[PDB]
Amino acid sequence: RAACQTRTLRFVSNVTEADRILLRWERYEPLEARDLLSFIVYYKESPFQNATEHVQSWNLLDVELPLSRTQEPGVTLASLKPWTQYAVFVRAITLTTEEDSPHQGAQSPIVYLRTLPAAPTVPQDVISTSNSSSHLLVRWKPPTQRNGNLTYYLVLWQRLAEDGDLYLNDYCHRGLRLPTSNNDPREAQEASFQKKFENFLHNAITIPIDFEIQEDKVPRERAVLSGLRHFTEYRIDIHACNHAAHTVGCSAATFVFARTMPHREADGIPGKVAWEASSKNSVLLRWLEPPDPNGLILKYEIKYRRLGEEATVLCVSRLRYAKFGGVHLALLPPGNYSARVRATSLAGNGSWTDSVAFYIL
Amino acid sequence: VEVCPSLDIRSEVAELRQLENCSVVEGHLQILLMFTATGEDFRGLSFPRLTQVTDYLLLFRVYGLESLRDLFPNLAVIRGTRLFLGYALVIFEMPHLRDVALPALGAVLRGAVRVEKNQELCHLSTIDWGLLQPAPGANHIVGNKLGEECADVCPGVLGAAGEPCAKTTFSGHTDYRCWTSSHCQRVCPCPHGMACTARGECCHTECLGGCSQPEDPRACVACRHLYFQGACLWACPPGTYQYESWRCVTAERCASLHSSTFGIHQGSCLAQCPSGFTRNSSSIFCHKCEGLCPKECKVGTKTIDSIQAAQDLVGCTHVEGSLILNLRQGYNLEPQLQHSLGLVETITGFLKIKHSFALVSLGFFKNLKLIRGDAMVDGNYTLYVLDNQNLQQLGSWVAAGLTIPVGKIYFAFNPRLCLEHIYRLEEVTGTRGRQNKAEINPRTNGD
């Protein structure tokens, strides 16, 4: 019926795409008469260059040869993962009803074709921590789909300015929860939501080209960022890359937000606290703001007390402090008074300064 | 004032320029994936003319954008005719975003709100969604900045920007309601869904979002029920019909808007008539179907290789083209292929079946009645069954049901197809002498 002496079919043209493979081979016209034949193409994903024909594991594909003199048969394999090796070979069928006629089957050598690479998947499991006030340590995992030969990771970190609402407020009333640095130890609708927002990112590419983005390239799956400001938040974008100068580019970012450790003594008050009393029992105390605090200064707490009795505290906002450059203390019994001042920043409480002593008569 | 169909914007702030003259988006507005965007590009960009989005609003990874208070300073109503998985407003993974800030937002007619994974975004507990949505319990607002980690400063409260505004109750909390530190939410005394103005007196009932004069339908900024000729109406005038669930159009206008499958059943000019109704060429109104919808499907030469490749034809009755079945790797495909193919009643072109090793029988063409043969296989063939290793029944679309006007048939290499079935097909087709030997001849089919 079939499977007679076997001929050889040569591939005349191969085209590789990101997820397609176009193939052509010479037109094997049968040594026959008003008969019929067609080809069947076997292709399977084989990482290595060892594979066995005829056998399932393979994926079959029928191709009827066109009825003309030009346009060699050709096929277009589709839905192929990028940067994968595929073993392909074609085989003629040439089923005939002739009584006495050679069958003369034909097939082709197994040929391995590699499809073009594309941008890889976003990095997975990005974690970050701070070991000091000017360093950030970042770790992650390789992308799920490398889509090529992994070469490096593009790391970008951008400084984040504090929101303006902290600047205008009175934090003596309605206090808020202060932020902290980083100390990480370095359902159908939900699935559809994540699937849609992953298909959104599948078409996203990145060209490997108070706010200033600075670039870095890292070979391993870990990075250290140095020279940062103290107690300032940073946004970190991490893209996986491969041969991407001509490819569609690098991956999409996997940004995380990390804050550096507070500076230990950035909230200290410079110089010494001066004063200038008034004849109406009211006294005025002056002190200059810290130049570079941890984020910003929320309030000033001043502790004053008469010589001998208990202590009294007073909270002052930025607005009240800046309205006159200091603090007024009125309606007090005459005597010798001692005062200490502290600054409160986003990191937390500051350090008490030296005592200032004055008199009221 | 402007049509402005649904628009997706990506990858460039320049692409955001297609809303210059837009007034009402008759669709969904998407802004996403703007990696190379800074806080300077979005500072000088504003679209004050946009005042309504019919479908929904989505924002996804727009870098540099800090607030929507400048992008859409006059956006008022989100109709929510269709939803992004039930959400009319989605804001996801937005770096640098600090507040939602839609200061002119009047209502979200239908759909929930999803504001997730914006690490720098707060001012979300200072807004009551009860004065915006009718069912605020479906909102999904998690993953943002910690609620107690930022000061949701409203223009009133403590020493702030200035004049305060009213406070309501949303989830058992009586606190100030505000959008940003300067703009704060708008309320006014009258029953729900009654838009008001600067004077505080709320406008006509049909108004929505806002107005300019009270108790004047022509002065509304957004029509609650229907819109026509700069006025808000409970229903369209008798000479017009609804369109996109939001405006009134004449018959010829909505006929031109879809230029063949449109219909005006139940006073609503849709794009495809619903189930149970259809129209072909008469006056455009989806009258009730007799017993089934004669869906017509046009394909050039639809090669079929699997059930998934055949699910396209689901529900088709008249096929304008040819079918080329080739099912080799399947197993017991008859019940699966009956659902897809089997409502077909006429094939204008040819029918070919090659190398179908998985097809035990051709019984999934039960309603097939005619194969005219307009598209005709080379060699003067219309029915071309070739190389079917196990094909026994050849279906039941026989006994005077079948009719092939032109073109011959061709059966070859069907060992298990007994010649009795082929000869019965020849008899019921009414054309037996059309073919000749070696086209049906044994030693190939019928062993």
From Swiss-Prot, chain A:
Autophosphorylated on tyrosine residues between pH 7.9 and pH 10.5. Residues 210-361 are extracellular. Residues 5-118, 122-191, 269-361 form the Fibronectin type-III domain. Disulfide bonds join C172-C315. It comes from the Eukaryota. It is found in: Membrane. Coiled coil: none annotated. Glycans are attached at N14, N50, N131, N149, N336, N349. Probable tetramer of 2 alpha and 2 beta chains linked by disulfide bonds. The alpha chains contribute to the formation of the ligand-binding domain, while the beta chains carry the kinase domain. Receptor with tyrosine-protein kinase activity. Functions as a pH sensing receptor which is activated by increased extracellular pH. Activates an intracellular signaling pathway that involves IRS1 and AKT1/PKB. Belongs to the protein kinase superfamily. Tyr protein kinase family. Insulin receptor subfamily. The extracellular domain is required for sensing alterations in external pH. This is Insulin receptor-related protein. It comes from Homo sapiens (Human). The gene is INSRR. The chain holds residues 479 to 910 of 1297 of the full protein.
